[PDB]
Amino acid sequence: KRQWALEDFEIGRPLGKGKFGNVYLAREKQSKFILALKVLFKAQLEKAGVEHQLRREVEIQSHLRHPNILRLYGYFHDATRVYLILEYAPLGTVYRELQKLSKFDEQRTATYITELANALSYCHSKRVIHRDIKPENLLLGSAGELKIADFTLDYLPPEMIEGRMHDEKVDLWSLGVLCYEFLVGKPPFEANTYQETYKRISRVEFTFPDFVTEGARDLISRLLKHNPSQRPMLREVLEHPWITANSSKP
Ligand SMILES: COc1ccc(Nc2nccc(-c3ccc4c(c3)CCCC(=O)N4)n2)cc1
């Protein structure tokens, strides 16, 4: 736990430009170690009321070490800005891949779902649940392995939007949503408005294009149950026949 400063880094290529600061390639001067630097504006964290949410996320994310979870090495701030020192994921976001390829084959999807489930299983056994398990938040390492990055309805389970009580089962719903989006190229409750999406999620109205195979339909259908208790354990996901037939990672 060495306290860092901007002068300890050479900043490079913008990796992502969003409304919330930006993420840059950076290199640590002394070590030459390449990483990614997320630049947040402190006045936009006060006035979005999330400074607590940041502090707690940073604390949790610094302790977590899994091959499919993007490492947070540390953080610092100056007058204006807060800096997150992150693992650099050379092959970029799953979002971008999905934009490129429009949709993923069964093998790539099943592999991604394995990697997710593994990283989630590990998460859960440290009492960490998640909300934004979505393509913008999944990155790809040098080996093309999935890495969960973490910090609009489309990925949220019924219990959450309805305002009901929720458990670790939210993340199972997310896998189903993502599994669907990976194969189809759009998430299963997508709409043109929030209000309608809300209805689609709440009534669990999804359908499958012809090309989605029977095994995939079965797994997605099992993951997208209204009743949390009826969604499978992560172990059952990893041991689904469609997953084991198609995945590449064990
Ligand atoms: C376009 O090619 C890339 C792009 C990113 C990378 N590596 C990388 N490594 C750590 C963080 C990030 C990161 C973090 C948050 C983020 C983004 C990116 C931008 C789009 C998604 C989004 O909404 N926000 N990217 C490598 C090649």
Author numbering: 125 to 275, 292 to 390
Quote the study that presented this structure, word for word.
The Aurora kinases A, B and C are serine/threonine kinases involved in the regulation of the cell division process. Aurora A is involved in the transition from the G2 to the M phase of the cell cycle by promoting centrosome maturation and mitotic spindle development. Dysfunction or overexpression of Aurora kinases has been observed in various human tumors, such as breast, lung, ovarian, prostate and colon cancer.
To confirm the binding mode of the members of the new Aurora A inhibitor class, we determined the crystal structures of the kinase in complex with the representative inhibitors 2a and 2c. The two cocrystallized inhibitors shared similar binding modes, which were in agreement with the ones suggested by the docking analyses employing the constraint between the aniline NH and Ala213 of the protein. While the anilinopyrimidine elements of the inhibitors adopted flat configurations in the ATP adenine binding pocket, the benzazepine-2-one partial structures filled the hydrophobic region. Another hydrogen bond was detected between the carbonyl group of Ala213 and the NH group of the aniline element. The third contact was established between the pyrimidine nitrogen atom 1 and the NH group of Ala213. In the structure with 2c, an additional interaction between the methoxy group of the ligand and Arg137 was observed. The main result drawn from the docking studies and the crystal structure analyses was the finding that the 3- and 4-positions of the aniline ring are oriented towards the entrance of the ATP binding pocket. Therefore, these positions were assumed as suitable attachment points for further substituents that would not interfere unfavorably with binding.
